[model samples]
Target: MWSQNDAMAFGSQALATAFNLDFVHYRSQISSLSPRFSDEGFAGYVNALQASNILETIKKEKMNLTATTGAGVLVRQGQMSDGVWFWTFQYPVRMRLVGQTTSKPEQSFVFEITIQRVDPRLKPSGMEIRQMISRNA
Candidate 1:
């Protein structure tokens, strides 16, 4: 018998793990890469950077990036008749780029992660990223 708090905690941890893994994969793909410098170079590069603050941070920091989750806040919660739990959680994530000698400032972003579980005996089976927007992009 999983209480609401237990469900929330489990959901939060599972969701955060998925979110960080995805984020790491994304960063890995983008690291050691640079924007194209073709005829439509500057504009295209800027547009690509605008796609996400993480990209922008990578460009600004000029290094590989890593993220860590801080805390999760439950935004919404619901349960299905089949003993499944659904939750939307917002987590504060700190983004750090490697190879910085000077005193560079750190940035944090909020990620809204939604997850669903079909059984309390197991962890969440499905996770979705609702949004990953930066407060100051």
Candidate 2:
């Protein structure tokens, strides 16, 4: 049996991994934004932030931008212990700027991502074992 702490730690790692994967993929779909390392990074990032709306872009424009998807979650059995495993499916993250601009508007970029699990968690389950025994007299 594994302690609750261990389970929590493992779950946290999985969640983080999932988040990273999501960001990687989503980063690619940012057509309005430029790569963080690219020369256009600043321009792209700024344009995307000022876009009128994002929800519509993701749904109608097919721009592959979305920020309202539930965290991609997945769970599985620990390979080396009697515990559970979980992770997020890879996806994309859409970064934009948020804040008021009326009085000397301040511009700040924010990052939000969406993900779908490759193998989402489905209620913790126990490990599987198979064996056969035979007795001879």
Candidate 3:
């Protein structure tokens, strides 16, 4: 049996650290192997700290970005036929620059680690991230 919780923590925690500006740790958590991660587009965005000027943008907008793991998790989409699995870990981070900064100020996220297993015991492939903002008054 796959160690659901452990594997999820392994991959899911990467999202936690990645968003928190811990580049070293996040890089360490992901695989060293390249070709596969090439397909895992999120890897490219890591450099967005500078490349995308996200840090500056968040500050300019008077916003705060916080992170939480294991808050809202959904582990499904296990495509055994194709040797694939998905664990979507989402939010409860709840920190923002609140109150009508824009039409939406609630920035939260959900990301899934896509595991396309080549071996039953080997680490799977690809990671995914999707974040959305909600509006509440």
Candidate 4:
């Protein structure tokens, strides 16, 4: 049986992969990782980044920017209800805001992601991020 620890490890890697823009790697890590809110979750996620001026910073600044998760990623297990497993975790994110120039400082944030076993006999699938709220946001 898959334990909560397995889910945590996968969730951490999945979040890191997604933020890193490794679509090839990200896709392989997830299975139907959809947002709980069709427009709200995705829209909120993007808007939050925009509000932070990170998007504009990367674009207008002409920077080859990137965000990566640092060490000490933490995950907490939530009750399994409705056949889905819920987990929350936090990690430090470092960003390369400027292309080949200077890099941006690192920040920390918490993310809540959930996974469901498509088949009772198989392992749990990739997690879906239900919400992501930054410490400063």
lDDT of each: 0.46, 0.28, 0.42, 0.50
lDDT per residue for candidate 4 within 1-137, as digits (tens), equals 54666655665665564455322333333223343223344454565466556656655655543566655344665556575656665655554454555666654454544433334334234444455555541
The lDDT ranking, best first, is 4, 1, 3, 2
Among all candidates shown, the one with the greatest lDDT? 4
Over 4 Å off, model 4:
21-44, 72-75, 80-83, 101-126
- Tell me model 4's lDDT, rounded to 2 decimals: 0.50
TM-score of each model, in listed order:
0.45, 0.21, 0.44, 0.58
lDDT of 3 by residue, 2-43 (tens): 455654554555455555532223344334333233344455
Pick out the ten consecutive residues of candidate 2 with the lowest summed lDDT: 128-137
Residue 33 in model 3: lDDT: 30
Q: For residues 26-62, could you state the per-residue lDDT of candidate 1 as single tens digits?
A: 4554331221111232233234236444455555555
Candidates 1 and 2 compared: the better one by lDDT is 1
Which of the two, 1 or 3, has more TM-score? 1
lDDT per residue, candidate 2, 19-69, as tens digits? 221223444444322211123324333344345344343334334322222
lDDT for residue 110 in candidate 3, whole number 0-100: 41
